[PDB]
Design an enzyme around this catalytic site. Sequence first.
Site, PDB file in Angstrom:
ATOM      1  CG  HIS A   1      -3.682   0.437  -4.279  1.00  0.00           C
ATOM      2  ND1 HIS A   1      -4.152   1.041  -3.129  1.00  0.00           N
ATOM      3  CD2 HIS A   1      -2.566  -0.236  -3.914  1.00  0.00           C
ATOM      4  CE1 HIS A   1      -3.354   0.752  -2.116  1.00  0.00           C
ATOM      5  NE2 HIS A   1      -2.382  -0.023  -2.565  1.00  0.00           N
TER       6      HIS A   1
ATOM      7  CB  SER B   1      -3.487  -6.554   0.729  1.00  0.00           C
ATOM      8  OG  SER B   1      -4.378  -5.790   1.515  1.00  0.00           O
TER       9      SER B   1
ATOM     10  CG  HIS C   1      -1.844  -1.278   1.137  1.00  0.00           C
ATOM     11  ND1 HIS C   1      -2.978  -1.491   0.380  1.00  0.00           N
ATOM     12  CD2 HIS C   1      -1.641  -2.421   1.834  1.00  0.00           C
ATOM     13  CE1 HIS C   1      -3.438  -2.709   0.609  1.00  0.00           C
ATOM     14  NE2 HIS C   1      -2.645  -3.292   1.487  1.00  0.00           N
TER      15      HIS C   1
ATOM     16  NE  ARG D   1      -6.666  -5.662   8.210  1.00  0.00           N
ATOM     17  CZ  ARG D   1      -7.759  -4.899   8.161  1.00  0.00           C
ATOM     18  NH1 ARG D   1      -7.979  -4.097   7.120  1.00  0.00           N
ATOM     19  NH2 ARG D   1      -8.692  -5.020   9.100  1.00  0.00           N
ATOM     20  NE  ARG D   2     -10.325  -8.134   1.440  1.00  0.00           N
ATOM     21  CZ  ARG D   2     -10.933  -6.963   1.594  1.00  0.00           C
ATOM     22  NH1 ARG D   2     -12.164  -6.913   2.079  1.00  0.00           N
ATOM     23  NH2 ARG D   2     -10.283  -5.836   1.325  1.00  0.00           N
TER      24      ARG D   2
ATOM     25  CB  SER E   1      -6.386  -0.248  -1.596  1.00  0.00           C
ATOM     26  OG  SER E   1      -6.260   0.857  -0.724  1.00  0.00           O
TER      27      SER E   1
HETATM   28  C1  LIG Z   1      -4.505  -6.255   2.866  1.00  0.00           C
HETATM   29  O1  LIG Z   1      -4.540  -7.635   2.917  1.00  0.00           O
HETATM   30  C2  LIG Z   1      -3.278  -5.773   3.646  1.00  0.00           C
HETATM   31  O2  LIG Z   1      -3.090  -4.570   3.845  1.00  0.00           O
HETATM   32  N1  LIG Z   1      -2.431  -6.704   4.067  1.00  0.00           N
HETATM   33  C3  LIG Z   1      -1.199  -6.407   4.809  1.00  0.00           C
HETATM   34  C4  LIG Z   1      -1.377  -6.659   6.289  1.00  0.00           C
HETATM   35  C5  LIG Z   1      -0.870  -7.816   6.865  1.00  0.00           C
HETATM   36  C6  LIG Z   1      -0.999  -8.053   8.223  1.00  0.00           C
HETATM   37  C7  LIG Z   1      -1.643  -7.135   9.033  1.00  0.00           C
HETATM   38  I1  LIG Z   1      -1.877  -7.530  11.108  1.00  0.00           I
HETATM   39  C8  LIG Z   1      -2.155  -5.972   8.476  1.00  0.00           C
HETATM   40  C9  LIG Z   1      -2.022  -5.736   7.107  1.00  0.00           C
HETATM   41  C10 LIG Z   1      -5.819  -5.676   3.488  1.00  0.00           C
HETATM   42  C11 LIG Z   1      -6.976  -6.633   3.263  1.00  0.00           C
HETATM   43  N2  LIG Z   1      -6.166  -4.353   2.969  1.00  0.00           N
HETATM   44  C12 LIG Z   1      -6.348  -3.327   3.790  1.00  0.00           C
HETATM   45  O3  LIG Z   1      -6.175  -3.423   5.012  1.00  0.00           O
HETATM   46  C13 LIG Z   1      -6.713  -1.977   3.136  1.00  0.00           C
HETATM   47  C14 LIG Z   1      -5.548  -1.020   3.300  1.00  0.00           C
HETATM   48  C15 LIG Z   1      -5.827   0.326   2.698  1.00  0.00           C
HETATM   49  O4  LIG Z   1      -6.908   0.544   2.154  1.00  0.00           O
HETATM   50  N3  LIG Z   1      -4.860   1.244   2.777  1.00  0.00           N
HETATM   51  C16 LIG Z   1      -5.004   2.483   2.061  1.00  0.00           C
HETATM   52  C17 LIG Z   1      -3.825   3.275   2.548  1.00  0.00           C
HETATM   53  C18 LIG Z   1      -2.992   2.400   3.434  1.00  0.00           C
HETATM   54  C19 LIG Z   1      -3.663   1.052   3.535  1.00  0.00           C
HETATM   55  N4  LIG Z   1      -7.896  -1.346   3.712  1.00  0.00           N
HETATM   56  C20 LIG Z   1      -9.018  -1.111   3.038  1.00  0.00           C
HETATM   57  O5  LIG Z   1      -9.166  -1.402   1.844  1.00  0.00           O
HETATM   58  C21 LIG Z   1     -10.130  -0.413   3.832  1.00  0.00           C
HETATM   59  N5  LIG Z   1     -10.624   0.745   3.089  1.00  0.00           N
HETATM   60  C22 LIG Z   1     -10.343   1.994   3.465  1.00  0.00           C
HETATM   61  O6  LIG Z   1      -9.694   2.269   4.489  1.00  0.00           O
HETATM   62  C23 LIG Z   1     -10.905   3.110   2.588  1.00  0.00           C
HETATM   63  C24 LIG Z   1      -9.757   3.757   1.790  1.00  0.00           C
HETATM   64  C25 LIG Z   1      -8.711   4.352   2.732  1.00  0.00           C
HETATM   65  C26 LIG Z   1      -9.105   2.716   0.875  1.00  0.00           C
HETATM   66  C27 LIG Z   1     -10.312   4.865   0.964  1.00  0.00           C
HETATM   67  C28 LIG Z   1     -11.281  -1.384   4.198  1.00  0.00           C
HETATM   68  C29 LIG Z   1     -10.726  -2.619   4.903  1.00  0.00           C
HETATM   69  C30 LIG Z   1     -12.231  -0.707   5.134  1.00  0.00           C
HETATM   70  C31 LIG Z   1     -12.040  -1.781   2.947  1.00  0.00           C
END
Ligand SMILES: *[C@@](O)(C(=O)NCc1ccc(I)cc1)[C@H](C)NC(=O)[C@H](CC(=O)n1cccc1)NC(=O)[C@@H](NC(=O)CC(C)(C)C)C(C)(C)C
Lengths: 230, 230
Positions: free
Chosen positions: B140, B123, B54, B148-149, B125
Amino acid sequence: DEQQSQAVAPVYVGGFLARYDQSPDEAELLLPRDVVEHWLHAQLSVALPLNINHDDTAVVGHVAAMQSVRDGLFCLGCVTSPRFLEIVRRASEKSELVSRGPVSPLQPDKVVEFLSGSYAGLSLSSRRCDDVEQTTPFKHVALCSVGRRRGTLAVYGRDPEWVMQRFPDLTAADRDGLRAQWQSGDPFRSDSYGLLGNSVDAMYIRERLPKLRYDKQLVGVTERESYVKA
Amino acid sequence: DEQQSQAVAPVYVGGFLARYDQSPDEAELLLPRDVVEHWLHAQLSVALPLNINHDDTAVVGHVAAMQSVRDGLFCLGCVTSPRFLEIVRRASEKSELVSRGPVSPLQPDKVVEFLSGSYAGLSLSSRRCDDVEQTTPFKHVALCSVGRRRGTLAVYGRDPEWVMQRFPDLTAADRDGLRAQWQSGDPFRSDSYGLLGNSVDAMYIRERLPKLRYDKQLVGVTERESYVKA
Ligand SMILES: *[C@@](O)(C(=O)NCc1ccc(I)cc1)[C@H](C)NC(=O)[C@H](CC(=O)n1cccc1)NC(=O)[C@@H](NC(=O)CC(C)(C)C)C(C)(C)C
Ligand SMILES: *[C@@](O)(C(=O)NCc1ccc(I)cc1)[C@H](C)NC(=O)[C@H](CC(=O)n1cccc1)NC(=O)[C@@H](NC(=O)CC(C)(C)C)C(C)(C)C
């Protein structure tokens, strides 16, 4: 410009290279108290190198002190490599782990906090200690993600007194022996790609974190405070 | 001189961004089939970027295809960044994991192997899909150590037909819809140091490997063969 020079200052490392009360997972990891001592006596002369995961091209410092104590062998090494320390300074700037910082009373130390998350364990390199036998038997110490011998957690600090005091087990007499021990430039011959590469190896070592907590508890760094990230 | 450029070639990656047959850990990871469907249609215009964990200053490429299959959302991205590839190339030459090569019938591919070990997860976003409401919702996709999923393992390879083949769930019709999708220069704004720092953060995620192993079984790569280091 000075803060950067402050972080790039020498870092100190201390830990048990072997806790006598622990039975290895592999027979070759056997290093008995009587053997350690005899070896320790046979050798200390020049200062053993401290390298990154045993790599001869990643020498970051030297081991300053070695001391057989009641519970195992203890070492006190010093990371004096300018280039390595600079690579770590740079890289620490980019870690979100480092960013979260230490535990309250402790002041942030990006370099020390980086080496602590990455190279969380010590690993000795020595003569094959096999059944029926027991000069320079101690070859070098290595900073690595985890150790093959349990209880070898690596405690990093800017002061050799500070790190030494982290281990509840040591005694005044112990620390004396050690202190008395410490009392062509940059040895590093690798780089960020070299360390980036190493980073993946450590990522596939099974049960690394569980070992590190086991080690933390064992050595007692739990009941104290440092930059230990494990 | 050319073997180098042989490795600096584009690397593809595929893997589920979410398996509709998986209860999320954190509620904020809810990505239902219907929601995905909807968004996909509302959005594929410009190609989402492909970045390292990210970081917006660490875009390695772009996502060539995304498709809501029966078991989840599959995506296919391509690592094209020259700078990144070279950093991952010179780093691979320093990894012992990669030094051990892949499984028998497969050819050693250092860069593809390095990416498999390090960036083992995929992962997404996305917009906050919370209970009550369900333009451009897909921000992205990110390459990271774990996801996380669950069931979001990252299979890498030099050919998108191959990487797609690693997944026992994808039907021909599936591979068709994805294939149809793919049928300013280097977006990377970071470096080795920035990548070195990220390594440590990965090194503290708890239960990573066991999550990855569960990922491999669920999606199927277990009963196939790839560079999956996990
Ligand atoms: C993804 O797998 C991940 O980040 N994995 C790495 C990880 C490993 C272990 C651990 I403990 C934590 C993380 C994961 C499924 N994706 C997310 O967490 C995203 C991250 C971001 O969106 N992100 C943007 C900037 C920095 C990180 N989270 C999301 O997609 C969230 N959406 C939002 O926050 C809205 C915005 C910011 C994208 C507009 C939701 C989880 C709420 C959908
Ligand atoms: C040390 O903890 C270590 O290397 N840990 C990293 C590690 C973590 C997890 C996993 I899974 C694997 C590795 C460990 C205790 N030290 C050793 O294994 C040393 C390594 C080297 O000495 N070495 C030199 C060059 C490459 C590795 N092993 C030893 O010291 C052995 N001694 C010898 O092989 C004799 C020589 C080569 C040192 C002269 C003995 C364990 C037999 C003493």
